[PDB]
Design a protein around this ligand. Structure first.
Ligand SMILES: c1cnc2[nH]ccc2c1
Length: 167
């Protein structure tokens, strides 16, 4: 049993809810919240900007030190950093950004990072301002992630479309 509430069960391991990942993280304090990161960990907008704003910019300060030491992530890659006030850990995952021309096949590699964690609160990778089709992102998530993932979908209209169209 875990603390996640109000989710619709899609599969054995994937759950979905219309919720802001920031408000959900604040309520649950999950072991792992996933950030929709870019390779530079520049948390300007979308999930990354809202998460970072909720940490009072502490996520960005930590991220800048990580990049200064390690250099940029790979598209499809990830790193584990602090969850600050939102979670124990933040798994920063880089899905391909279609609005930068990145290979959508890298979305499966991105979701494979989730398998290193038993339970996660996450957004749909490469959705929103990353430009991918969220229906596609949910299909790759279900077909790739084997650990227990609780997906937060901010947009109520999109949530309803994801549920209604789910095979
Ligand atoms: C998905 C879930 N929660 C969010 N909060 C801000 C953006 C976003 C996207």
């Amino acid at each position: 049993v875990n603390s996640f509430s109000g989710y619709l069960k899609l599969t054995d391991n994937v759950y979905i809810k219309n919720a802001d990942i920031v408000e959900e993280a604040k309520k649950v304090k999950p072991t792992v919240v996933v950030n929709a990161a870019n390779v530079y960990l520049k948390h300007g907008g979308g999930v990354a900007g809202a998460l970072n704003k909720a940490t009072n910019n502490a996520m960005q300060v930590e991220s800048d030190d990580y990049i200064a030491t390690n250099g940029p992530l790979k598209v499809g890659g990830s790193c584990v950093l602090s969850g600050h006030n939102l979670a124990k850990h933040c798994l920063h995952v880089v899905g391909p950004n279609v609005n930068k021309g990145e290979d959508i096949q890298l979305l499966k590699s991105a979701y494979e990072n989730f398998n290193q964690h038993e339970v996660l609160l996450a957004p749909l990778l490469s959705a929103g301002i990353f430009g991918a089709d969220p229906i596609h992102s949910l299909r790759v998530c279900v077909d790739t992630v084997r650990t227990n993932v609780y997906l937060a979908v901010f947009d109520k209209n999109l949530y309803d479309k994801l549920v209604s169209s789910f095979l």
